[PDB]
Every structure is written in structure tokens, then in C-alpha cells.
Amino acid sequence: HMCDAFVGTWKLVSSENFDDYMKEVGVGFATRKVAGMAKPNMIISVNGDVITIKSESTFKNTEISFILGQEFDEVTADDRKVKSTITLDGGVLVHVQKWDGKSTTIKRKREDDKLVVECVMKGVTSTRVYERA
Numbered sequence: 001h002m003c004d005a006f007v008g009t010w011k012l013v014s015s016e017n018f019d020d021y022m023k024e025v026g027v028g029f030a031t032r033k034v035a036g037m038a039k040p041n042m043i044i045s046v047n048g049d050v051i052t053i054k055s056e057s058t059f060k061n062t063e064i065s066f067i068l069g070q071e072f073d074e075v076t077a078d079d080r081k082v083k084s085t086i087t088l089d090g091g092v093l094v095h096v097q098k099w100d101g102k103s104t105t106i107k108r109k110r111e112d113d114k115l116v117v118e119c120v121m122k123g124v125t126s127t128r129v130y131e132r133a
């Protein structure tokens with residue numbers, strides 16, 4: 001029942017500061033431009049202890065399946081190979097990605113009828129808001 005309120009089909013409706021976040025992560029110019037245009041659909045589902053997050057866009061399709069607290073390998077939309085751990089902190093999904101000595105955190109929370117995503121790289125944050133599709 002853990003993540004029930006996250007389950008569903010979500011579509012991006014707003015983004016703020018995403019180019020600067022991507023720059024801070026180390027994403028190159030061309031990928032930033034094309035990734036920044038995308039309006040992804042994110043499909044979140046749960047089956048037993050396994051959570052699946054799929055993202056579909058004109059840029060890239062991604063899929064991760066995981067168990068809370070259990071590290072896994074992830075290939076990100078910008079083709080980083082990272083080690084990821086996702087936990088729940090007070091109702092917020094907290095997703096840490098580690099690679100090349102670096103780390104970034106993606107937080108996902110329900111707020112009103114939205115799914116709010118905050119991407120943090122050091123001092124740089126981006127907020128991405130999704131609504132039900």
C-alpha cells in the first residue's frame with residue numbers, strides 16, 4: 001500500500017531549472033537540448049514489494065524496477081550507468097544515484113493532484129510537475 005498514491009500514469013506539465021540541473025550533473029549540450037524538450041509520460045506500478053517506474057518520451061524510454069532500500073543498477077536517460085537506492089522518507093520517495101564519485105537525488109512526492117519531482121545536484125535544484133494522464 002506503500003506507494004499507492006504514486007501509482008498511475010503521469011504526464012509532465014511544468015519544469016523549472018532543468019537545464020541548470022542537467023549541466024550540474026554533467027550532461028552535454030546536445031543531450032540537454034533534446035532532453036529538455038521532452039514531455040514524458042511516467043507510469044508507476046507496484047506488484048508486491050516491487051515498484052516499477054517507466055518513463056516514455058520522444059527522447060528516451062527508461063524503466064526501473066526496485067525494492068525499497070535495495071541498491072540496483074540503473075541506466076539513466078542521458079546514458080549514465082549509476083548505482084541507485086530508493087527509499088521512502090515520510091511519504092516521499094528518495095532516489096539517490098551514485099556514479100563516478102558523484103551523487104544526485106531525485107525526490108518524488110504527491111501534492112494535491114500532482115506528482116512533484118525535485119532533482120538536486122549539489123546546490124542546484126530542478127522542479128518537475130506531473131499530472132494524471
Ligand SMILES: O=C1CC(c2ccc(Cl)cc2)CC(=O)C1=CO
Binds near residue numbers: 119
Ligand atoms: O526520473 C526522472 C528522470 C529525470 C531526468 C531526466 C533526464 C536527465 Cl538528463 C536527468 C534526469 C527527470 C524526471 O522528471 C524524472 C521523474 O521521475
